[PDB]
Amino acid sequence: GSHSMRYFYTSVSRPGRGEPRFISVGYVDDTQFVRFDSDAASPREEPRAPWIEQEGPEYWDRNTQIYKAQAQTDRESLRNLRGYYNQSEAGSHTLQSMYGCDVGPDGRLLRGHDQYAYDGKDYIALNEDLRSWTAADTAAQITQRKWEAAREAEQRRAYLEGECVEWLRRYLENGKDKLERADPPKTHVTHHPISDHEATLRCWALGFYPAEITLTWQRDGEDQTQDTELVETRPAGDRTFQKWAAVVVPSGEEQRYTCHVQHEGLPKPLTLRWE
């Protein structure tokens, strides 16, 4: 399939209350597999998916040291950013980082990512060529010039083409039962009278992985887009996801309405009715 690995770092300063809090999480596709939190009692990278658990102590120890060093580096970055933007030393600010690789079915790198936001706005990003930067403003151009002079892109590129892809492929193999085989939604339509003349039909998709899915109501085979309430896809808490779509219909006309579900785990798109 096409697969991705990504790390998401968040550092948040709190001047007067000590060093910034640093949290990292790692994902393969829609599956979180590791976390680190600098405010934990004795901070360490921890597993959050069963298939990563087989990695030996050297793995966890090296990653733990990496995160502790990254929290220090982000603290310095946050101080620099405060200066670049001439901001007060009293306020809290946020530095977020996200990086990783996408690979195809053959395992080859399709795209590498390495980018940063300050206070929830794009700051600097490594371009698709993995060789040049896009800076958001004159502050980010300071970072850009520093990184260009120090040949940063080439070292980022080395990680994204080498270790990122090699470790992603490993995780896919070790976790193949959970990562390579989509889990289709369990589906049902429920019916809720509003009054003697209107009722709600709600089409449910539960327990599916990965999160990508499409739910649509049709009336006599035509899409009812303008009239459908659709909720954001949401996590069930067990690594699977949920979504529903609802339409309000005249009482007695329910039989005209069908719910269509598309998901990678289905043998074919489903057509559901109130039944």
Binding site: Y7, S24, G26, Y59, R62, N63, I66, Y67, A69, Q70, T73, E76, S77, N80, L81, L95, Y99, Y116, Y123, I124, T143, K146, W147, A150, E152, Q155, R156, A158, Y159, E163, C164, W167
Partner: peptide
């Protein structure tokens, strides 16, 4: 597995 420093230096 995450990326290490050096490379990935301060902003």
């Amino acid at each position: 597995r995450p990326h290490e420093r050096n490379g990935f230096t301060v902003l």
